[PDB]
Design a protein around this ligand. Structure first.
Ligand SMILES: N[C@@H](CCC(=O)N[C@@H](CS)C(=O)NCC(=O)O)C(=O)O
Length: 217
């Protein structure tokens, strides 16, 4: 078995794909693409997007949830069998509505391999300042936004059923929630409630995906 996953480290959709390999303890070869590389993904799947899975037969497949469903079913014993929660879905809708106001200007300043060339980092800065707004301005509003995240995490704390699975049994809600919590560890100053923090730490070990406190800004 020699599947390959083409990603950006910061990308939550890439994190979703990475999660299933970790949960199932299936080895996968990670390749971090430079953020300004349109040619590689376009050759693979016809447009610039990540994640992209390369299967054993050398075929490429895009789309994080297609990749998750494919990998989970491969051995005929899916792990993502738990119920999903409408309350978690509502929470993610809300928080994903604004979290990038904190995340994007921080991603832009961080040591992710997709930004290893200064051209790739600049490409990201220019694209995201245009779409999300001026980074210095977003950063100036950090304390307000951090208050919002901390308050939303307080609400989430009551929804974490077990530290190993948000709804008590591994489900697609873990796939949708963890990448956001992982990325939020890049944000210094967040007050993490105990059950959320325990889930975050537990799921990071299950998935073998790194938390980002050492880079937090
Ligand atoms: N539906 C896709 C969305 C993936 C996506 O939007 N990835 C972003 C990075 S976070 C991307 O590739 N954007 C295009 C670009 O970076 O130019 C997923 O489920 O795989």
């Amino acid at each position: 078995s020699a599947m390959k996953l083409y990603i950006y480290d910061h990308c939550p959709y890439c994190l979703k794909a990475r999660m299933i390999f970790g949960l199932k303890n299936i080895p996968v070869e990670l390749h971090v693409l430079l953020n300004d590389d349109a040619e590689t993904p376009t050759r693979m799947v016809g447009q610039k997007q990540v994640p992209i899975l390369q299967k054993d037969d050398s075929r490429y497949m895009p789309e994080s949830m297609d990749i998750v469903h494919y990998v989970d079913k491969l051995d005929g014993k899916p792990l993502l069998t738990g119920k999903r929660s409408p309350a978690i879905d509502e929470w993610l809708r809300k928080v994903n509505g604004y979290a990038n106001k904190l995340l994007l200007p921080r991603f832009a300043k961080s040591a992710f391999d997709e930004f290893s060339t200064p051209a790739a980092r600049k490409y990201f800065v220019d694209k995201k300042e245009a779409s999300a707004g001026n980074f210095a301005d977003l950063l100036a509003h950090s304390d307000g936004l951090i208050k919002n995240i901390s308050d939303d995490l307080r609400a989430l704390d009551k929804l974490i059923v077990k530290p190993n699975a948000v709804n008590g049994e591994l489900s697609e809600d873990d796939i949708q929630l963890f990448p956001l919590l992982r990325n939020l560890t890049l944000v210094a100053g967040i007050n993490w409630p105990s059950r959320v923090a325990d889930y975050r730490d537990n799921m990071a070990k299950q998935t073998q995906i790194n938390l980002l406190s050492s880079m937090a800004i």
